[PDB]
Amino acid sequence: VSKANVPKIDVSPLFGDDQAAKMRVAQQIDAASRDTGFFYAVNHGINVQRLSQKTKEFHMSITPEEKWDLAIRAYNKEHQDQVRAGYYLSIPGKKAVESFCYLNPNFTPDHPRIQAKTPTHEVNVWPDETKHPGFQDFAEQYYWDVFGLSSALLKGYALALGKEENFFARHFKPDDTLASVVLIRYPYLDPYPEAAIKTAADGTKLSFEWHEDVSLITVLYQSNVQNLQVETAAGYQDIEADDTGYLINCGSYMAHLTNNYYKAPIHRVKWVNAERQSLPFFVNLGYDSVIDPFDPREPNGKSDREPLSYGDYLQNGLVSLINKNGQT
Ligand SMILES: [Fe+2]
Numbered sequence: 001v002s003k004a005n006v007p008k009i010d011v012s013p014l015f016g017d018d019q020a021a022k023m024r025v026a027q028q029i030d031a032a033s034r035d036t037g038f039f040y041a042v043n044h045g046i047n048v049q050r051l052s053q054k055t056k057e058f059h060m061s062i063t064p065e066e067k068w069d070l071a072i073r074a075y076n077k078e079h080q081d082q083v084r085a086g087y088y089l090s091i092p093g094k095k096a097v098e099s100f101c102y103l104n105p106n107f108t109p110d111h112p113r114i115q116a117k118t119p120t121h122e123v124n125v126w127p128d129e130t131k132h133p134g135f136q137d138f139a140e141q142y143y144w145d146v147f148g149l150s151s152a153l154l155k156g157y158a159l160a161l162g163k164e165e166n167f168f169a170r171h172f173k174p175d176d177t178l179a180s181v182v183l184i185r186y187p188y189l190d191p192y193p194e195a196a197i198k199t200a201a202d203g204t205k206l207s208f209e210w211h212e213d214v215s216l217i218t219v220l221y222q223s224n225v226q227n228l229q230v231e232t233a234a235g236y237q238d239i240e241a242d243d244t245g246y247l248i249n250c251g252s253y254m255a256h257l258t259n260n261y262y263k264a265p266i267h268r269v270k271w272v273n274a275e276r277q278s279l280p281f282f283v284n285l286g287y288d289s290v291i292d293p294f295d296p297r298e299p300n301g302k303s304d305r306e307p308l309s310y311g312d313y314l315q316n317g318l319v320s321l322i323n324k325n326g327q328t
Helices: 021-036 046-059 064-070 135-160 252-257 310-325
Strands: 008-009 038-042 085-088 096-102 178-184 205-211 219-224 226-231 235-238 246-250 267-270 278-281
Touching: 021 038, 021 135, 021 252, 046 178, 046 219, 046 278, 064 085, 085 135, 135 219, 135 252, 135 278, 205 310, 246 252, 252 310
Parallel strands: 008 038
Antiparallel strands: 038 246, 085 096, 096 178, 178 278, 205 267, 219 246, 219 278, 226 235, 226 267
8 A cells, every 4th residue: 555645835935925935835735736635734833732632631531421411413312403513422332433523613692693593503512611621712712723724725725726815715704614623532442343443345444434525625633643545546545644734635615616626535544543633624614605616727717617605515515424424
């Protein structure tokens, strides 16, 4: 099994005002997006040491009582309004992974999309502050930190495609973004439950099957345990781990609006019996955001693809992924 070419790109010029340096970053984003579809963002300015430590303290401290109280509707029939946000329980002996998902901290009972009961908008649920001091403060702060990095990355993607730098970022707003953070724990278990291991067609043991992401882009921090593979025409290739950088890839909304010029790479998660963390940020736009598709391959950029509202795209995509790859 070969290793994927995943370049490390210094994204720090995207926070600055040297326009030529920004173009040089854009070229590297373009090149990576047209090859395997993955790159590492380095020199990003986020304290990922604190991110991993605070996430670890939470996963290891939370009790079954608290998990039921935070559980999404798939695990707790009483929580009909928690489809996305909350705790995704493991099932001892059956399901190893567990995770906590939260949404835009600005979605409050007072927020107009919450008042209108608009699908995919939810109010976050949090553990008790006395049992997990500082956890909510940390997590909300982290959302805005990775929002900022993601904004900058979106300027690079715009420039790479020949657009003005706010082409995507103008739709990525703190008041209405549907972006989510998921804090995923993959545990060490001995014996490891066989029901939690999937066998791929090629024989590889997996934790999560092939998929394209439901996102515009995905901005991922993982601890230093190799697990991801990306599909190429010549088969799956291993993505090397790097626990100082963020792993970036496009989701299927980018593939839609570029007429597949930037594909959403198909990837899967190998089974590895090791304690590790996977902390994705899914860059989603607003419910009513619409970007007119274009084809960068054509001089006039003409595309026949229908514009797709981000809210409709997200509603269909999240359900489809659950149906295909299982309730996480
Ligand atoms: Fe993914």
